[PDB]
Design an enzyme around this catalytic site. Structure first.
Site, PDB file in Angstrom:
ATOM      1  CG  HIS A  20      -1.687   1.228   1.483  1.00 24.88           C
ATOM      2  ND1 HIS A  20      -2.864   1.522   0.829  1.00 24.88           N
ATOM      3  CD2 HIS A  20      -1.477   2.250   2.352  1.00 24.88           C
ATOM      4  CE1 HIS A  20      -3.337   2.675   1.279  1.00 24.88           C
ATOM      5  NE2 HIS A  20      -2.515   3.134   2.208  1.00 24.88           N
ATOM      6  CE1 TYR A  48       4.122   4.623 -20.717  1.00 25.66           C
ATOM      7  CE2 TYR A  48       4.883   5.543 -18.668  1.00 25.66           C
ATOM      8  CZ  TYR A  48       3.871   5.016 -19.433  1.00 25.66           C
ATOM      9  OH  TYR A  48       2.612   4.890 -18.883  1.00 25.66           O
ATOM     10  CB  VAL A 126       0.602  -3.376 -16.833  1.00 23.85           C
ATOM     11  CG1 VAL A 126       0.814  -2.510 -15.493  1.00 23.85           C
ATOM     12  CG2 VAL A 126       0.151  -4.829 -16.451  1.00 23.85           C
ATOM     13  N   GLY A 130      -3.953   1.521 -18.890  1.00 25.09           N
ATOM     14  CA  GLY A 130      -4.114   2.419 -17.753  1.00 25.09           C
ATOM     15  C   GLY A 130      -3.954   3.853 -18.235  1.00 25.09           C
ATOM     16  CG  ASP A 131      -0.271   5.438 -19.696  1.00 21.10           C
ATOM     17  OD1 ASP A 131       0.739   5.068 -20.314  1.00 21.10           O
ATOM     18  OD2 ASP A 131      -0.240   5.752 -18.487  1.00 21.10           O
TER      19      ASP A 131
HETATM   20 NA    NA Z   1      -2.216  -0.636  -3.504  1.00 20.70          NA
END
Ligand code: NA
Ligand code: NA
Length: 210
Positions: A20, A48, A126, A130-131
């Site tokens: 977390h 990237y 992934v 998401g982007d």
């Molecule tokens: Na998390």
């Protein structure tokens, strides 16, 4: 189940287990600032750049070419954003990868060197899905909370994509149509879990000041 559905199911699962962190939550709600945003985008340029070297190798090999749209490329865009955020080009020789980013980049380079199509598709999913979902939204938050100029937010806009909602549907259909041996498929799903874990670790390190 189609691959797109199975991958959604690897994501979900990987979220529980994830270390977390509150870095991104804090950033997006206005608790940090331009400095912390810049630190994120410097790390992003590293990963990237690695990702896109891997994409280039896998595309050139002839694997998943339609999925591997070069309009997705973000690395040069990020460099232009960072030129604006940092005021110069100097940052290229001075940014230091976090331990999570070193590990992530090392995996992406291994995928490149192995020309590992299935593993590359996992990481492409992934990062880019998401982007393609989190864009205009994060950019606006940076404008609103912190006054970041649009000149420094080019990462969030895909110049080559006219209709994002349709593009995502096509992307998922391209995933569902990829031809894979059972072993390649199993490898791709495992790697997607790993990629989500690398991503969570990048943010955990940012959240520790690393
Ligand atoms: Na998390
Ligand atoms: Na968040």
């Amino acid at each position: 189940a189609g691959l797109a559905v199975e991958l959604k199911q690897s994501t979900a699962q990987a979220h529980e287990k994830a270390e977390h962190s509150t870095f991104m939550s804090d950033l997006l709600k206005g608790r940090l600032g331009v400095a912390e945003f810049t630190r994120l985008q410097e790390q992003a340029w590293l990963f990237y750049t690695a990702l896109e070297q891997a994409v280039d190798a896998v595309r050139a090999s002839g694997f998943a070419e339609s999925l591997l749209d070069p309009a997705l490329n973000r690395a040069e865009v990020l460099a232009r954003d960072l030129d604006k955020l940092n005021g110069s080009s100097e940052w290229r020789s001075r940014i230091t990868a976090s331990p999570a980013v070193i590990d992530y980049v090392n995996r992406l380079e291994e995928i490149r060197d192995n020309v590992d199509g299935p593993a590359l598709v996992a990481h492409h999913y992934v990062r880019y899905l998401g982007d393609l979902s989190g864009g205009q939204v994060i950019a606006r938050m940076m404008q609103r909370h912190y006054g970041v100029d649009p000149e420094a937010l080019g990462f969030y806009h895909f110049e080559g994509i006219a209709k994002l909602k349709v593009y995502k549907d096509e992307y998922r259909e391209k995933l569902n149509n990829l031809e894979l041996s059972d072993e390649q498929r199993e490898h791709l799903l495992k790697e997607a879990t790993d990629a989500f874990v690398f991503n969570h670790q990048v943010f955990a390190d940012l959240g520790k000041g690393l």
